[PDB]
Amino acid sequence: MKLPTNLAYERSIDPSDVCFFVVWPDDRKTPLTYNSRTLLGQMEAASLAYDVSGQPIKSATAEALAQGNPHQVDFCHVPYGASHIECSFSVSFSSELRQPYKCNSSKVKQTLVQLVELYETKIGWTELATRYLMNICNGKWLWKNTRKAYCWNIVLTPWPWNGEKVGFEDIRTNYTSRQDFKNNKNWSAIVEMIKTAFSSTDGLAIFEVRATLHLPTNAMVRPSQVFTNSRVFQSTTIDGERSPILGAFKTGAAIATIDDWYPEATEPLRVGRFGVHREDVTCYRHPSTGKDFFSILQQAEHYIEVLSANKTPAQETINDMHFLMANLIKGGMFQHK
Amino acid sequence: MKLPTNLAYERSIDPSDVCFFVVWPDDRKTPLTYNSRTLLGQMEAASLAYDVSGQPIKSATAEALAQGNPHQVDFCHVPYGASHIECSFSVSFSSELRQPYKCNSSKVKQTLVQLVELYETKIGWTELATRYLMNICNGKWLWKNTRKAYCWNIVLTPWPWNGEKVGFEDIRTNYTSRQDFKNNKNWSAIVEMIKTAFSSTDGLAIFEVRATLHLPTNAMVRPSQVFTQNSRVFQSTTIDGERSPILGAFKTGAAIATIDDWYPEATEPLRVGRFGVHREDVTCYRHPSTGKDFFSILQQAEHYIEVLSANKTPAQETINDMHFLMANLIKGGMFQHK
Numbered sequence: 001m002k003l004p005t006n007l008a009y010e011r012s013i014d015p016s017d018v019c020f021f022v023v024w025p026d027d028r029k030t031p032l033t034y035n036s037r038t039l040l041g042q043m044e045a046a047s048l049a050y051d052v053s054g055q056p057i058k059s060a061t062a063e064a065l066a067q068g069n070p071h072q073v074d075f076c077h078v079p080y081g082a083s084h085i086e087c088s089f090s091v092s093f094s095s096e097l098r099q100p101y102k103c104n105s106s107k108v109k110q111t112l113v114q115l116v117e118l119y120e121t122k123i124g125w126t127e128l129a130t131r132y133l134m135n136i137c138n139g140k141w142l143w144k145n146t147r148k149a150y151c152w153n154i155v156l157t158p159w160p161w162n163g164e165k166v167g168f169e170d171i172r173t174n175y176t177s178r179q180d181f182k183n184n185k186n187w188s189a190i191v192e193m194i195k196t197a198f199s200s201t202d203g204l205a206i207f208e209v210r211a212t213l214h215l216p217t218n219a220m221v222r223p224s225q226v227f228t229n230s231r232v233f234q235s236t237t238i239d240g241e242r243s244p245i246l247g248a249f250k251t252g253a254a255i256a257t258i259d260d261w262y263p264e265a266t267e268p269l270r271v272g273r274f275g276v277h278r279e280d281v282t283c284y285r286h287p288s289t290g291k292d293f294f295s296i297l298q299q300a301e302h303y304i305e306v307l308s309a310n311k312t313p314a315q316e317t318i319n320d321m322h323f324l325m326a327n328l329i330k331g332g333m334f335q336h337k
Numbered sequence: 338m339k340l341p342t343n344l345a346y347e348r349s350i351d352p353s354d355v356c357f358f359v360v361w362p363d364d365r366k367t368p369l370t371y372n373s374r375t376l377l378g379q380m381e382a383a384s385l386a387y388d389v390s391g392q393p394i395k396s397a398t399a400e401a402l403a404q405g406n407p408h409q410v411d412f413c414h415v416p417y418g419a420s421h422i423e424c425s426f427s428v429s430f431s432s433e434l435r436q437p438y439k440c441n442s443s444k445v446k447q448t449l450v451q452l453v454e455l456y457e458t459k460i461g462w463t464e465l466a467t468r469y470l471m472n473i474c475n476g477k478w479l480w481k482n483t484r485k486a487y488c489w490n491i492v493l494t495p496w497p498w499n500g501e502k503v504g505f506e507d508i509r510t511n512y513t514s515r516q517d518f519k520n521n522k523n524w525s526a527i528v529e530m531i532k533t534a535f536s537s538t539d540g541l542a543i544f545e546v547r548a549t550l551h552l553p554t555n556a557m558v559r560p561s562q563v564f565t566q567n568s569r570v571f572q573s574t575t576i577d578g579e580r581s582p583i584l585g586a587f588k589t590g591a592a593i594a595t596i597d598d599w600y601p602e603a604t605e606p607l608r609v610g611r612f613g614v615h616r617e618d619v620t621c622y623r624h625p626s627t628g629k630d631f632f633s634i635l636q637q638a639e640h641y642i643e644v645l646s647a648n649k650t651p652a653q654e655t656i657n658d659m660h661f662l663m664a665n666l667i668k669g670g671m672f673q674h675k
Binding site: 003006014016017019088089090092094101102103104106109159204206208226227234236237238239247248249272273274276277278281282283286287288292294332333334335336337 | 374375376377378379380381382383384386387389393397399400402403404407412414416417418484485487553554555556557616617618619620
């Protein structure tokens with residue numbers, strides 16, 4: 001199947017910025033603040049003592065290499081008498097994946113629409129909705145702040161909902177595997193919200209998520225930081241103060257670390273075309289593998305006879321279908337030429 | 338009938354820009370603001386890994402394709418402790434479709450003048466004025482902001498009016514179909530303004546429209562954006578000393594006039610225009626080969642006068658051609674040639 005000259009979708013998951021608060025004892029809240037401060041380190045660079053080839057430069061003597069290298073960073077920490085930290089944002093799950101946002105070819109629109117209806121019927125939305133929601137219900141969107149913490153707690157507030165807010169107390173102890181989430185009192189009622197949101201022409205499903213981090217005394221917080229003072233935080237205005245925030249696009253990248261179907265999978269990757277790993281600077285699912293999104297999107301006509309048959313599909317060629325569906329929930333421009 | 342060398346009308350519906358405000362608890366209002374910020378995404382384009390034909394380009398190895406692509410967007414969101422968002426603008430309905438603004442042919446001016454008087458008598462202005470007024474009274478002019486919201490409300494303030502402002506509370510629940518709008522306490526009195534505006538040589542009918550959006554916590558708002566490295570650049574005005582996003586006047590008028598569901602295989606209503614286009618799937622319904630574009634219906638305008646001046650009920654097929662004929666005169670435009 002050819003790529004058209006116009007093909008684009010909208011995203012089906014819409015997160016927001018994360019706001020950081022300081023809860024004091026006797027329960028008053030205050031927005032967390034930060035300050036820039038200059039520091040002074042050693043002169044480690046391997047470019048100040050060596051050249052490009054690798055022999056020692058003769059200008060950097062032992063006295064000139066112990067001189068003092070001043071830097072300037074932003075610095076954010078928990079105040080002294082504080083109790084814990086609130087972190088609050090919101091997610092929507094809203095059915096944009098059913099038909100393309102823009103598509104000049106009517107044949108490609110019919111083919112893309114059938115796939116979503118075939119996938120919904122033959123495979124179902126249970127596997128993807130479980131994998132997105134297990135990144136909300138633990139501290140995956142709290143990136144490094146989860147690390148080096150006593151405990152953290154997640155409280156959900158789903159909107160088309162009756163009552164009794166959903167709580168996930170003491171992660172790192174109680175919510176480790178997939179089965180620990182399914183043992184919650186109301187887990188099948190929240191998974192079937194995301195399934196109803198994807199399976200309907202107007203599905204809505206808003207969540208209000210709020211966390212509670214119990215850090216050590218006077219400890220660090222790690223917010224997101226700007227693209228360009230060497231470490232500059234991203235910030236908004238709460239009341240009249242500046243306050244560090246976790247970026248909206250940073251938060252959506254944490255909900256979508258699902259991709260563990262690339263051919264030698266150990267660690268789940270953030271969902272993308274030719275899905276990259278930023279730990280080791282490589283692309284798993286390179287176009288030479290044949291298992292990027294554009295080599296699977298061309299096999300969309302072949303995947304229709306697999307799903308419209310009656311034999312259960314091979315697990316190997318439904319991992320290609322989970323990756324096809326996860327890139328349409330992600331959205332993007334799919335043009336060419 | 339041939340097209341004259343000069344034919345043009347004025348528009349009969351005049352919207353304005355939509356201004357956004359932030360309402361705080363204790364009911365103080367502040368204009369909504371935005372900022373630009375740079376982000377860092379992956380290197381997805383399909384022109385960075387593939388060539389025009391379809392084989393993989395060989396300069397894009399696995400390391401060079403995992404490198405990092407910085408962009409820059411405008412970013413507008415609801416503040417943290419905010420309650421909701423006001424959205425206010427105004428529409429007028431002003432009878433410019435009664436006569437041509439400019440027409441050098443007196444036979445064509447007479448034919449056009451007769452059609453509006455026979456449409457008004459035989460068919461009436463109830464069908465068009467109900468379709469325009471529904472797009473004001475729900476959040477159609479709030480394009481994507483209606484999506485992903487808790488609820489929204491519309492309050493009308495019509496000008497040649499006695500009192501008691503007209504309210505439409507909790508759309509997506511209370512106002513879904515045509516009959517839900519008709520069950521309002523004063524819906525007929527506002528439809529009979531737009532009818533009286535069209536049915537008169539000096540019809541005026543001003544509406545002051547104000548909305549109230551209950552978004553989630555810290556949520557996104559989607560304003561209109563300029564027709565221009567910044568990737569997303571919003572349209573803006575100045576309220577007090579602060580830039581603030583708008584949702585433009587041309588954009589607002591395109592939302593009131595998404596009415597055209599008379600094209601030959603109609604599913605979704607289109608924006609009213611000549612050879613009515615659909616920008617979702619980039620095609621023209623009502624193409625000149627269909628025979629149901631607006632310049633093929635002008636050439637049968639002498640034919641439509643014998644149908645409307647008979648006594649037999651007009652066929653639905655040839656009065657859905659009259660609704661599209663009337664909706665393009667309310668839209669206005671140069672109708673010349675050559």
